[PDB]
Amino acid sequence: TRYETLFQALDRNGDGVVDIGELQEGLRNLGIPLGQDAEEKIFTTGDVNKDGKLDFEEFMKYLKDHEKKMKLAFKSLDKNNDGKIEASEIVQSLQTLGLTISEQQAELILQSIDVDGTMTVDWNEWRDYFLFNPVTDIEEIIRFWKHSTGIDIGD
């Protein structure tokens, strides 16, 4: 599908495109603390022709480019290169950025993304969590963790 499913779920009035209000409602269903300018940010990037709607191609292009960035952010946390993120890697990656986070705080992050209870975050879990979050790189993700979810991260 996979976007085709998401797109149709978003296109509530079935006119074949997603308007900013429809996207706004979609974000609302995620239960993740995004800013009230999140759909505006997504549209700023995604509505390439500035006609005020996201067609499927624009929607797909937005998500596909976003996914690429999210893979790079995932990779930058995966210090041992096994395709998984564990708590210790969050601690050590932030430390190399000059940020201190305790093991317990890193576990809170892990718990918010880990869906199958492995205490490891895999690409699908990471991607799905971040799919509709406007963040563009690991720093923004960290900004989100501290300033939106309250995780204790000190510089």
Interface with Ca ion includes 80 (CB under 5 A)? Answer: yes
Dihedral angle of Cα 64, 67, 72, 78, to the nearest 10 degrees: -150
State which residue, 83 or 154, has the beta carbon closest to Ca ion: 83
Q: Which of residues 16-45 bind Ca ion (CB under 5 A)?
A: 36
Element (H, E) at 6: helix 3-10
Task: Identify the DSSP state of 53.
Answer: E
How far is the CA of 138 from the CAs of 14, 26, 93, in angstroms? 35, 24, 10
List residues binding Ca ion (CB under 5 A): 11, 13, 15, 36, 47, 49, 51, 53, 78, 80, 82, 84, 114, 116, 118
Q: Binding site membership: which residues?
A: 11, 13, 15, 17, 22, 47, 49, 51, 53, 58, 78, 80, 82, 84, 89, 114, 116, 118, 120, 125
